[PDB]
Amino acid sequence: MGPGFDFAQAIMKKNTVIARTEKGEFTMLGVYDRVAVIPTHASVGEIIYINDVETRVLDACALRDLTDTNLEITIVKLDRNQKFRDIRHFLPRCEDDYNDAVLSVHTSKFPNMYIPVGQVTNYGFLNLGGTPTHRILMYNFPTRAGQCGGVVTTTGKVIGIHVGGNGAQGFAAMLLHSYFT
């Protein structure tokens, strides 16, 4: 509808796949080469389905901060025959608050879904499903099951991936440039 949705659509059309684990179907953001991200609660194993094709996982790292606190981001290297467009230059360098963000989801249940979530707070600490979690972004939208892995963007930045909600607010894990050097 406008330039927020334009940037979101550009990311979805080239930099997302549908990932399936034993824990469900997730939006998965490809960042560069064969490297992608997914919520840690997807429980990535040795094999994952990528657009319904059996794919070997070459490496998987569940990120934690230097206090040994969950960040809810798993970085996955896929045994895929094709690279992602390199979008690392759209990643923020530091923790921040944002205006006018879009959450974009693409799964079998929710194809071509875009949600204007509005203002995004650097929330910080969240007890996410019982697990202490840091670097959480919050937006005041009633996000639902099937949105995990959804990409959070502003115009010109890819800022996070959706990891949960409480019925009234949604929560994303930050993406930072330093995760992907």
Swiss-Prot record:
> What is the reaction catalyzed?
Selective cleavage of Gln-|-Gly bond in the poliovirus polyprotein. In other picornavirus reactions Glu may be substituted for Gln, and Ser or Thr for Gly
Give residue ranges for domain Peptidase C3: 2-180
**Subcellular localization(s) per the UniProt record:** Host cytoplasm
Q: Which residues form the active site?
A: H41 (for protease 3c activity), E72 (for protease 3c activity), C148 (for protease 3c activity)
| Quaternary structure (record) | Interacts with host IFIH1/MDA5; this interaction inhibits host IFIH1.
What does this protein do, in the record's words?
A: Major viral protease that mediates proteolytic processing of the polyprotein. Cleaves host EIF5B, contributing to host translation shutoff. Also cleaves host PABPC1, contributing to host translation shutoff. Binds and inhibits host IFIH1/MDA5, thereby inhibiting the type-I IFN production and the establishment of the antiviral state. Cleaves host MAP3K7/TAK1, resulting in inhibition of TRAF6-triggered NF-kappa-B induction. Cleaves host TICAM1; this interaction allows the virus to disrupt host TLR3 signaling. Cleaves host IRF7, resulting in inhibition of type-I IFN production.
Q: What is this protein called?
A: Protease 3C
* Species of origin: Human enterovirus D68 (EV68)
Q: Supply the source organism's classification.
A: Viruses, Riboviria, Orthornavirae, Pisuviricota, Pisoniviricetes
- Span within the parent record: 1549 to 1728 of 2188
